[PDB]
Curated annotation (Swiss-Prot), chain B:
Both isoforms are expressed in vivo; the experiments here were performed with the shorter protein which is shown here. Belongs to the PUR DNA-binding protein family. A transcription and translation regulator. Binds DNA adjacent to the erp transcriptional promoter; in combination with BpbA inhibits transcription from the promoter. EbfC counteracts the effect of Bpur on BpbA. Overexpression leads to decreased amounts of ErpA protein. Binds DNA and RNA; binds preferentially to RNA (dissociation constant 13 nM), dsDNA (dissociation constant 130 nM) and least well to ssDNA (dissociation constant 390 nM). Binds to its own (RNA) transcript in vivo and in vitro but not to its (DNA) promoter; inhibits translation from its mRNA. This is Transcriptional/translational repressor BpuR. One of its GO terms (molecular function) is RNA binding. It comes from Borreliella burgdorferi (strain ATCC 35210 / DSM 4680 / CIP 102532 / B31) (Borrelia burgdorferi). The gene is bpuR. The lineage of its organism: Bacteria, Pseudomonadati, Spirochaetota, Spirochaetia, Spirochaetales. One of its GO terms (biological process) is regulation of translation. The chain holds residues 6 to 79 of 122 of the full protein. It comes from the Bacteria.
Amino acid sequence: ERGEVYSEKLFTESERTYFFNVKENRKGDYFLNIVESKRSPSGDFERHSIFVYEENINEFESNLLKAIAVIKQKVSTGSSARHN
Amino acid sequence: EVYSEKLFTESERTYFFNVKENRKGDYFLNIVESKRSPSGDFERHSIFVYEENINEFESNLLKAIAVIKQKVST
Ligand SMILES: [Mg+2]
């Protein structure tokens, strides 16, 4: 697909499915498009879409990594330890 | 609300990076894009990611971002 540089889909075990897209504009600049597609209880599809331009990618990335770190800090890990 | 950071840009787009806690105590990420219309009204685009999907969401986001970062350094 012309104008579409990269596209990946992520299914989850929840009603949320994500798309990670890299598109090219008229000038040849790239931009990111993150889409969440949520299936409502009724069966309708809600699409939430965020755009990030080439110029703000670095800051977007470092801020994403900082927010995710807060969650990764919280989450319980793999640990003679016996689970279940 | 566990964490909240705002990213201003030199454009009509502002981003929010939020970490919230639900009833159960599970964390979730919320990425918000605030788009400023010429009139002065704000468009809010919001994405939620549950704790259990955070690793896969992050690695997929980083793979897409890397594609852009590789272009700009070429
Ligand atoms: Mg699913």
